[PDB]
Amino acid sequence: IWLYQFRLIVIGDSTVGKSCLIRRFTEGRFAQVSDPTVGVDFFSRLVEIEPGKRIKLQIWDTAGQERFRSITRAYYRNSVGGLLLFDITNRRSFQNVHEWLEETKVHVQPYQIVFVLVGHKCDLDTQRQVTRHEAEKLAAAYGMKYIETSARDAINVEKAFTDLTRDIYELVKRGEITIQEGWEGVKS
């Protein structure tokens, strides 16, 4: 059925589109109306990364609101990978990416989380407040890749999760990430 199970965490400011991204990926639908997340919700999906090779993704949908941050950060340890969103139409959400990144950098046990930077709501092209280039430069400065997604228009949603799963899978194949006693980030 699957080779590995990976735990992924999706993080970023409130309202950037984390829950909608995850629901488009797992439910294939766009939630036109979306309550702010309280604590951390759970979604799952199998992905076939290569023919006959499946990875189970256990996805933690985190609350962006500041008052739930104590809950969100409790999940960093047991995550192997994640997506860090900003909203391309919300420059303050981009300004906060460095803060989200600096905070994950002190959560490097058993490993640094494998992150991709996600410029979300890329359907709102005329409302853009962040250039692709400055987001690509920020991602590169933290050694991560960048992708622009839309939950509304189903743009790059499968690719965001699938590319990150392939990256983690290759790190596991090289032994750079391994199963660890009591860690839930990777399971055989």
Binding site members for Mg(2+): 19, 37, 61
Contacts of 52 (CB under 8 A, 6+ apart): none
| Binding residue ranges for GTP | 14, 17-20, 34, 37, 64, 120-121, 123, 151-152
Q: CA–CA separation, 14 vs 79, rounded Å? A: 20
Q: Which does 186 bind (CB under 5 to 8 A by kind): ligand GNP, Mg ion, none?
A: none
Q: Using CB atoms within 10 A of its CB, is residue 73 exposed (0-12), middle (13-18) or buried (19+)?
A: middle
Reduced to 3 states (helix: H, G, I; strand: E, B; else coil), residue 43 is strand
At 108, phi and psi to the nearest 5? Answer: -115, 15
Q: Does 96 bind ligand GNP (CB under 6 A)?
A: no
Query: Quick one: which of 8, 59, 63, 97 contacts ligand GNP (CB under 6 A)?
Result: 63
Distance in Å, CB of 142 to ligand GNP, minimum = 20
Contact yes or no for 147/118 (Cβ under 8 A): yes
Distance in Å, CB of 19 to ligand GNP, minimum = 3
Site of interaction with ligand GNP (CB under 6 A): 14-20, 32, 34, 36-37, 63-65, 120-121, 123-124, 150-152
